[PDB]
Amino acid sequence: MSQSNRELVVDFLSYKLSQKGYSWSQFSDVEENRTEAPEGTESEAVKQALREAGDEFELRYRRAFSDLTSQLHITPGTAYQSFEQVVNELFRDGVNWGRIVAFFSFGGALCVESVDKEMQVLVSRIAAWMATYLNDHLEPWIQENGGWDTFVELYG
């Protein structure tokens, strides 16, 4: 239960960005070293659910309210605000998986939008804003309603 939530942040963000055509380690640093558990790892399964959840989450949004990268608007001086703003109002009404699925969806989306614009570095910046919020802002909620085991139980 909770070992390295950051790995989950780096993974999802790296995966989504990898689907758009961007490389995480290319400009992420992952605050350590791109490795990620091979297979059969607890945390590994966690990312698997986040990837499956984010995929279905972004899909519904993409099918209904179109993609995200082609809507938002982040800059070198409003990225941390754009994120905090969407994550704030999103978790303002009350934290929850659905809010976390979007939290991760927005994180990876912003990175792609920042890289597409001219702020590849923002990928790692958001990486710290997302992870930090995940571990410090919603982490408690995670273990509260079951944790990554539940999220994995619902999506996995």
Partner: peptide, 23 residues
């Protein structure tokens, strides 16, 4: 100004549809 707020709203609804508690 009218980008992030609207964005969050869209993510919010998607959450309700993809939230659930357990099982």
């Amino acid at each position: 100004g009218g980008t992030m707020e609207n964005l969050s709203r869209r993510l919010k609804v998607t959450g309700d549809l993809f939230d659930i508690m357990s099982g």
